[PDB]
Amino acid sequence: MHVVICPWLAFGHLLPCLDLAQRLASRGHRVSFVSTPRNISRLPPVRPALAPLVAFVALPLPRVEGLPDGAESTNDVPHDRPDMVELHRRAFDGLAAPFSEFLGTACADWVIVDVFHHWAAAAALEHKVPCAMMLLGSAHMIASIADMSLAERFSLTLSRSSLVVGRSCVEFEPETVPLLSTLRGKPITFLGLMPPLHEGRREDGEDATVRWLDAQPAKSVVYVALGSEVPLGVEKVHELALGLELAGTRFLWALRKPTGVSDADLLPAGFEERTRGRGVVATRWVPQMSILAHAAVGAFLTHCGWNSTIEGLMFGHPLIMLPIFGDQGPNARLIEAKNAGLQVARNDGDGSFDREGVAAAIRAVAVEEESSKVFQAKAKKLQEIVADMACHERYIDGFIQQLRSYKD
Ligand SMILES: C=C1C[C@@]23CC[C@H]4[C@@](C)(CCC[C@@]4(C)C(=O)O[C@@H]4O[C@H](CO)[C@@H](O)[C@H](O)[C@H]4O)[C@@H]2CC[C@]1(O)C3
Ligand SMILES: O=c1ccn([C@@H]2O[C@H](COP(=O)(O)OP(=O)(O)O)[C@@H](O)[C@H]2O)c(=O)[nH]1
């Protein structure tokens, strides 16, 4: 089959979509990976064996006054500037006509579109190409939802599609997957957990963060990362920093800067001087898969993005959970219910946290001998499911067969 994939302009979408593209190409299907040029230039390379079977289709973002050139993704357009978020949505919607022009002559068997691709789903109707909408999260998240604004963009994409695709399986969510049939009348299918393949990202194993981990004791380091886009304002950064310090563990923190904040204002006064001997802060993109694979990493302080949840558990790390938005709350509650992580205490109403809550969660998951042992054992039970690579390849096979059967 020729499958056209259209990920949302966000690295939590682009990365699993490029993994899915290569998995499809590995079974001898061909993929057109449709995105914008700077987003494509920042992606891991396709294996030489798959080069002619994964075609990158670069559609330039139209120019919009107030949106900087090269600001193509949620990693480049910060949530803490809602005016720029809106300009980026306008630019994204401007891809409609070029996408429809591409699709008409593409000889596509399927289009797989992301949650806000209402125009791509409209093009698939116009060109009589079956269209699957990606909702690459948990069955629990899809069940939550089942129970131009984002909700309206989502609703329109869904209505125009034929199929909804989740990223889970009955082994991981036995309570939910059998209960799901349709989402607003559309059949739901699960393509498995699709944990990333060994070195699919071709990260730098000589990265300064990994060389620091090489020097630390086994399972001694709390890795701290909040994915590629969620906002954390400078006051919240300071509470997270002081909580990490207070709990006393070794730490490696991949931190994105709030907009406007100088390196000098980013962290509490003296925090890096005091913690230099046990912790490292990196304000750049880090090789998260190399870090989570590392023997030095014990617990993962995560925002519970679905990629980070899967990546943490595929190496049996218990989670210290700080959900910020979207599916993160549902993801954190799902893992807490499996006893493999603990959420940081939040104020009910505004969802605030403080250094004491951060420190208390770190001590419970990573330090206290009895609780930490149970969290580790429960995370290892989940790793048996998440890291069953053969199980997840069978689900990819099953997904391809379901795409084939709709055509026939
Ligand atoms: C009523 C609602 C249900 C809701 C659940 C979460 C859901 C939606 C945002 C739809 C898309 C997927 C998902 C899981 C989500 O949070 O996606 C994320 O949205 C961000 C923008 O908010 C993007 O920048 C991210 O890249 C994307 O990963 C969805 C629709 C609007 C909402 O308010 C929230
Ligand atoms: O410094 C970073 C930050 C994030 N990631 C990767 O970016 C993705 C983040 O996706 P997730 O669903 O966890 O959160 P989002 O960014 O969508 O909020 C994951 O695959 C991470 O491995 C990374 O490699 N390095």
Side-chain angles (χ1 to χ4, degrees), residues 320-341:
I320 303 152
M321 299 185 292
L322 191 72
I324 303 301
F325 75 30
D327 60 326
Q328 291 148 35
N331 297 342
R333 296 188 291 266
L334 182 69
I335 302 316
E336 200 166 59
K338 299 177 183 301
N339 292 300

PDB file of all heavy atoms in Angstrom, residues 320-341:
ATOM      1  N   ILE A 320       8.002   9.576  38.590  1.00  0.00           N
ATOM      2  CA  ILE A 320       7.619  10.686  39.506  1.00  0.00           C
ATOM      3  C   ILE A 320       6.891  11.672  38.609  1.00  0.00           C
ATOM      4  O   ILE A 320       7.535  12.191  37.680  1.00  0.00           O
ATOM      5  CB  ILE A 320       8.856  11.321  40.167  1.00  0.00           C
ATOM      6  CG1 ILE A 320       9.692  10.299  40.934  1.00  0.00           C
ATOM      7  CG2 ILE A 320       8.439  12.491  41.039  1.00  0.00           C
ATOM      8  CD1 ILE A 320      11.168  10.669  41.007  1.00  0.00           C
ATOM      9  N   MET A 321       5.580  11.794  38.788  1.00  0.00           N
ATOM     10  CA  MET A 321       4.706  12.302  37.708  1.00  0.00           C
ATOM     11  C   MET A 321       4.253  13.741  37.973  1.00  0.00           C
ATOM     12  O   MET A 321       3.669  14.038  39.035  1.00  0.00           O
ATOM     13  CB  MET A 321       3.542  11.336  37.504  1.00  0.00           C
ATOM     14  CG  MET A 321       4.066   9.974  37.088  1.00  0.00           C
ATOM     15  SD  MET A 321       2.839   8.744  36.672  1.00  0.00           S
ATOM     16  CE  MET A 321       2.142   8.516  38.292  1.00  0.00           C
ATOM     17  N   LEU A 322       4.531  14.607  37.000  1.00  0.00           N
ATOM     18  CA  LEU A 322       4.168  16.042  37.044  1.00  0.00           C
ATOM     19  C   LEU A 322       3.405  16.413  35.773  1.00  0.00           C
ATOM     20  O   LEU A 322       3.919  17.163  34.939  1.00  0.00           O
ATOM     21  CB  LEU A 322       5.441  16.873  37.214  1.00  0.00           C
ATOM     22  CG  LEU A 322       5.186  18.343  37.531  1.00  0.00           C
ATOM     23  CD1 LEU A 322       4.670  18.507  38.945  1.00  0.00           C
ATOM     24  CD2 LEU A 322       6.424  19.192  37.307  1.00  0.00           C
ATOM     25  N   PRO A 323       2.169  15.898  35.571  1.00  0.00           N
ATOM     26  CA  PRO A 323       1.404  16.190  34.358  1.00  0.00           C
ATOM     27  C   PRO A 323       1.083  17.685  34.273  1.00  0.00           C
ATOM     28  O   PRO A 323       0.800  18.290  35.290  1.00  0.00           O
ATOM     29  CB  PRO A 323       0.117  15.374  34.500  1.00  0.00           C
ATOM     30  CG  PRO A 323      -0.006  15.138  35.986  1.00  0.00           C
ATOM     31  CD  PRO A 323       1.421  15.016  36.481  1.00  0.00           C
ATOM     32  N   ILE A 324       1.107  18.234  33.064  1.00  0.00           N
ATOM     33  CA  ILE A 324       0.887  19.684  32.843  1.00  0.00           C
ATOM     34  C   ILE A 324      -0.418  19.905  32.070  1.00  0.00           C
ATOM     35  O   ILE A 324      -1.171  20.774  32.505  1.00  0.00           O
ATOM     36  CB  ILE A 324       2.112  20.333  32.176  1.00  0.00           C
ATOM     37  CG1 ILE A 324       3.389  20.114  32.991  1.00  0.00           C
ATOM     38  CG2 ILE A 324       1.873  21.819  31.925  1.00  0.00           C
ATOM     39  CD1 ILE A 324       3.329  20.653  34.383  1.00  0.00           C
ATOM     40  N   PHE A 325      -0.670  19.204  30.962  1.00  0.00           N
ATOM     41  CA  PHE A 325      -1.874  19.450  30.127  1.00  0.00           C
ATOM     42  C   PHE A 325      -2.246  18.215  29.298  1.00  0.00           C
ATOM     43  O   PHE A 325      -1.535  17.203  29.286  1.00  0.00           O
ATOM     44  CB  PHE A 325      -1.737  20.760  29.336  1.00  0.00           C
ATOM     45  CG  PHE A 325      -0.836  20.816  28.120  1.00  0.00           C
ATOM     46  CD1 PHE A 325      -0.600  19.717  27.307  1.00  0.00           C
ATOM     47  CD2 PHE A 325      -0.277  22.031  27.740  1.00  0.00           C
ATOM     48  CE1 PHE A 325       0.208  19.817  26.176  1.00  0.00           C
ATOM     49  CE2 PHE A 325       0.517  22.136  26.602  1.00  0.00           C
ATOM     50  CZ  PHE A 325       0.776  21.026  25.830  1.00  0.00           C
ATOM     51  N   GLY A 326      -3.412  18.296  28.648  1.00  0.00           N
ATOM     52  CA  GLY A 326      -3.856  17.299  27.663  1.00  0.00           C
ATOM     53  C   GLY A 326      -3.980  15.902  28.239  1.00  0.00           C
ATOM     54  O   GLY A 326      -4.696  15.720  29.254  1.00  0.00           O
ATOM     55  N   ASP A 327      -3.356  14.923  27.590  1.00  0.00           N
ATOM     56  CA  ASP A 327      -3.493  13.502  27.993  1.00  0.00           C
ATOM     57  C   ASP A 327      -2.578  13.192  29.180  1.00  0.00           C
ATOM     58  O   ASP A 327      -2.638  12.052  29.645  1.00  0.00           O
ATOM     59  CB  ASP A 327      -3.213  12.539  26.840  1.00  0.00           C
ATOM     60  CG  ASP A 327      -1.837  12.625  26.211  1.00  0.00           C
ATOM     61  OD1 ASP A 327      -1.282  13.747  26.140  1.00  0.00           O
ATOM     62  OD2 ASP A 327      -1.350  11.572  25.752  1.00  0.00           O
ATOM     63  N   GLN A 328      -1.790  14.162  29.660  1.00  0.00           N
ATOM     64  CA  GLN A 328      -0.769  13.893  30.713  1.00  0.00           C
ATOM     65  C   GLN A 328      -1.454  13.497  32.020  1.00  0.00           C
ATOM     66  O   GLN A 328      -0.999  12.529  32.654  1.00  0.00           O
ATOM     67  CB  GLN A 328       0.158  15.086  30.883  1.00  0.00           C
ATOM     68  CG  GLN A 328       1.047  15.263  29.657  1.00  0.00           C
ATOM     69  CD  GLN A 328       1.401  16.697  29.374  1.00  0.00           C
ATOM     70  OE1 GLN A 328       1.580  17.509  30.281  1.00  0.00           O
ATOM     71  NE2 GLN A 328       1.583  16.999  28.092  1.00  0.00           N
ATOM     72  N   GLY A 329      -2.496  14.215  32.419  1.00  0.00           N
ATOM     73  CA  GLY A 329      -3.263  13.875  33.626  1.00  0.00           C
ATOM     74  C   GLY A 329      -3.776  12.436  33.576  1.00  0.00           C
ATOM     75  O   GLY A 329      -3.485  11.638  34.465  1.00  0.00           O
ATOM     76  N   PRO A 330      -4.560  12.065  32.539  1.00  0.00           N
ATOM     77  CA  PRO A 330      -5.010  10.687  32.367  1.00  0.00           C
ATOM     78  C   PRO A 330      -3.859   9.670  32.347  1.00  0.00           C
ATOM     79  O   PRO A 330      -3.993   8.614  32.926  1.00  0.00           O
ATOM     80  CB  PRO A 330      -5.740  10.746  31.013  1.00  0.00           C
ATOM     81  CG  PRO A 330      -6.270  12.128  30.971  1.00  0.00           C
ATOM     82  CD  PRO A 330      -5.175  12.981  31.558  1.00  0.00           C
ATOM     83  N   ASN A 331      -2.748  10.007  31.702  1.00  0.00           N
ATOM     84  CA  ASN A 331      -1.579   9.086  31.629  1.00  0.00           C
ATOM     85  C   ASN A 331      -1.028   8.869  33.040  1.00  0.00           C
ATOM     86  O   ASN A 331      -0.769   7.702  33.390  1.00  0.00           O
ATOM     87  CB  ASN A 331      -0.506   9.577  30.658  1.00  0.00           C
ATOM     88  CG  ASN A 331      -0.990   9.649  29.224  1.00  0.00           C
ATOM     89  OD1 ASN A 331      -1.994   9.031  28.867  1.00  0.00           O
ATOM     90  ND2 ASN A 331      -0.270  10.387  28.402  1.00  0.00           N
ATOM     91  N   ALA A 332      -0.910   9.933  33.840  1.00  0.00           N
ATOM     92  CA  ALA A 332      -0.341   9.858  35.209  1.00  0.00           C
ATOM     93  C   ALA A 332      -1.248   8.984  36.085  1.00  0.00           C
ATOM     94  O   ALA A 332      -0.734   8.105  36.785  1.00  0.00           O
ATOM     95  CB  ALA A 332      -0.168  11.244  35.788  1.00  0.00           C
ATOM     96  N   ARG A 333      -2.561   9.174  36.000  1.00  0.00           N
ATOM     97  CA  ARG A 333      -3.530   8.395  36.808  1.00  0.00           C
ATOM     98  C   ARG A 333      -3.504   6.924  36.402  1.00  0.00           C
ATOM     99  O   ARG A 333      -3.663   6.066  37.284  1.00  0.00           O
ATOM    100  CB  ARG A 333      -4.923   8.980  36.643  1.00  0.00           C
ATOM    101  CG  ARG A 333      -4.971  10.392  37.188  1.00  0.00           C
ATOM    102  CD  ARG A 333      -6.381  10.906  37.207  1.00  0.00           C
ATOM    103  NE  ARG A 333      -6.981  11.147  35.917  1.00  0.00           N
ATOM    104  CZ  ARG A 333      -6.989  12.314  35.284  1.00  0.00           C
ATOM    105  NH1 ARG A 333      -6.332  13.353  35.782  1.00  0.00           N
ATOM    106  NH2 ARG A 333      -7.650  12.426  34.147  1.00  0.00           N
ATOM    107  N   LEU A 334      -3.320   6.634  35.116  1.00  0.00           N
ATOM    108  CA  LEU A 334      -3.250   5.238  34.619  1.00  0.00           C
ATOM    109  C   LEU A 334      -2.051   4.527  35.256  1.00  0.00           C
ATOM    110  O   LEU A 334      -2.200   3.376  35.732  1.00  0.00           O
ATOM    111  CB  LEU A 334      -3.102   5.283  33.099  1.00  0.00           C
ATOM    112  CG  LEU A 334      -3.071   3.922  32.425  1.00  0.00           C
ATOM    113  CD1 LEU A 334      -4.429   3.286  32.529  1.00  0.00           C
ATOM    114  CD2 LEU A 334      -2.651   4.043  30.970  1.00  0.00           C
ATOM    115  N   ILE A 335      -0.891   5.178  35.246  1.00  0.00           N
ATOM    116  CA  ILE A 335       0.350   4.550  35.784  1.00  0.00           C
ATOM    117  C   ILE A 335       0.248   4.484  37.320  1.00  0.00           C
ATOM    118  O   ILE A 335       0.695   3.473  37.896  1.00  0.00           O
ATOM    119  CB  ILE A 335       1.607   5.291  35.284  1.00  0.00           C
ATOM    120  CG1 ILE A 335       1.670   5.320  33.753  1.00  0.00           C
ATOM    121  CG2 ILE A 335       2.882   4.699  35.882  1.00  0.00           C
ATOM    122  CD1 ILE A 335       1.344   4.007  33.073  1.00  0.00           C
ATOM    123  N   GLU A 336      -0.323   5.497  37.974  1.00  0.00           N
ATOM    124  CA  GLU A 336      -0.474   5.472  39.459  1.00  0.00           C
ATOM    125  C   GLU A 336      -1.338   4.262  39.836  1.00  0.00           C
ATOM    126  O   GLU A 336      -1.057   3.594  40.832  1.00  0.00           O
ATOM    127  CB  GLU A 336      -1.058   6.799  39.955  1.00  0.00           C
ATOM    128  CG  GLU A 336      -0.826   7.071  41.431  1.00  0.00           C
ATOM    129  CD  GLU A 336      -1.116   8.527  41.753  1.00  0.00           C
ATOM    130  OE1 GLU A 336      -2.273   8.954  41.516  1.00  0.00           O
ATOM    131  OE2 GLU A 336      -0.187   9.250  42.128  1.00  0.00           O
ATOM    132  N   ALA A 337      -2.345   3.954  39.023  1.00  0.00           N
ATOM    133  CA  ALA A 337      -3.283   2.838  39.254  1.00  0.00           C
ATOM    134  C   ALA A 337      -2.562   1.501  39.074  1.00  0.00           C
ATOM    135  O   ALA A 337      -3.066   0.501  39.592  1.00  0.00           O
ATOM    136  CB  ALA A 337      -4.487   2.967  38.336  1.00  0.00           C
ATOM    137  N   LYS A 338      -1.409   1.481  38.407  1.00  0.00           N
ATOM    138  CA  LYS A 338      -0.578   0.264  38.238  1.00  0.00           C
ATOM    139  C   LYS A 338       0.558   0.253  39.270  1.00  0.00           C
ATOM    140  O   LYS A 338       1.378  -0.681  39.212  1.00  0.00           O
ATOM    141  CB  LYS A 338      -0.055   0.190  36.806  1.00  0.00           C
ATOM    142  CG  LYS A 338      -1.137   0.097  35.739  1.00  0.00           C
ATOM    143  CD  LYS A 338      -0.572   0.112  34.341  1.00  0.00           C
ATOM    144  CE  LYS A 338      -1.632   0.091  33.271  1.00  0.00           C
ATOM    145  NZ  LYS A 338      -2.494  -1.100  33.381  1.00  0.00           N
ATOM    146  N   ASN A 339       0.589   1.230  40.183  1.00  0.00           N
ATOM    147  CA  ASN A 339       1.513   1.261  41.346  1.00  0.00           C
ATOM    148  C   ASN A 339       2.966   1.429  40.867  1.00  0.00           C
ATOM    149  O   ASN A 339       3.880   1.131  41.648  1.00  0.00           O
ATOM    150  CB  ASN A 339       1.337   0.013  42.221  1.00  0.00           C
ATOM    151  CG  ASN A 339      -0.003  -0.017  42.928  1.00  0.00           C
ATOM    152  OD1 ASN A 339      -0.305   0.881  43.712  1.00  0.00           O
ATOM    153  ND2 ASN A 339      -0.787  -1.052  42.694  1.00  0.00           N
ATOM    154  N   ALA A 340       3.179   1.964  39.662  1.00  0.00           N
ATOM    155  CA  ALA A 340       4.515   2.081  39.031  1.00  0.00           C
ATOM    156  C   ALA A 340       4.986   3.538  39.052  1.00  0.00           C
ATOM    157  O   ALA A 340       6.060   3.843  38.526  1.00  0.00           O
ATOM    158  CB  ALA A 340       4.490   1.518  37.646  1.00  0.00           C
ATOM    159  N   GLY A 341       4.228   4.411  39.695  1.00  0.00           N
ATOM    160  CA  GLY A 341       4.625   5.822  39.834  1.00  0.00           C
ATOM    161  C   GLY A 341       3.756   6.540  40.837  1.00  0.00           C
ATOM    162  O   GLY A 341       2.732   5.980  41.254  1.00  0.00           O
TER     163      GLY A 341
END
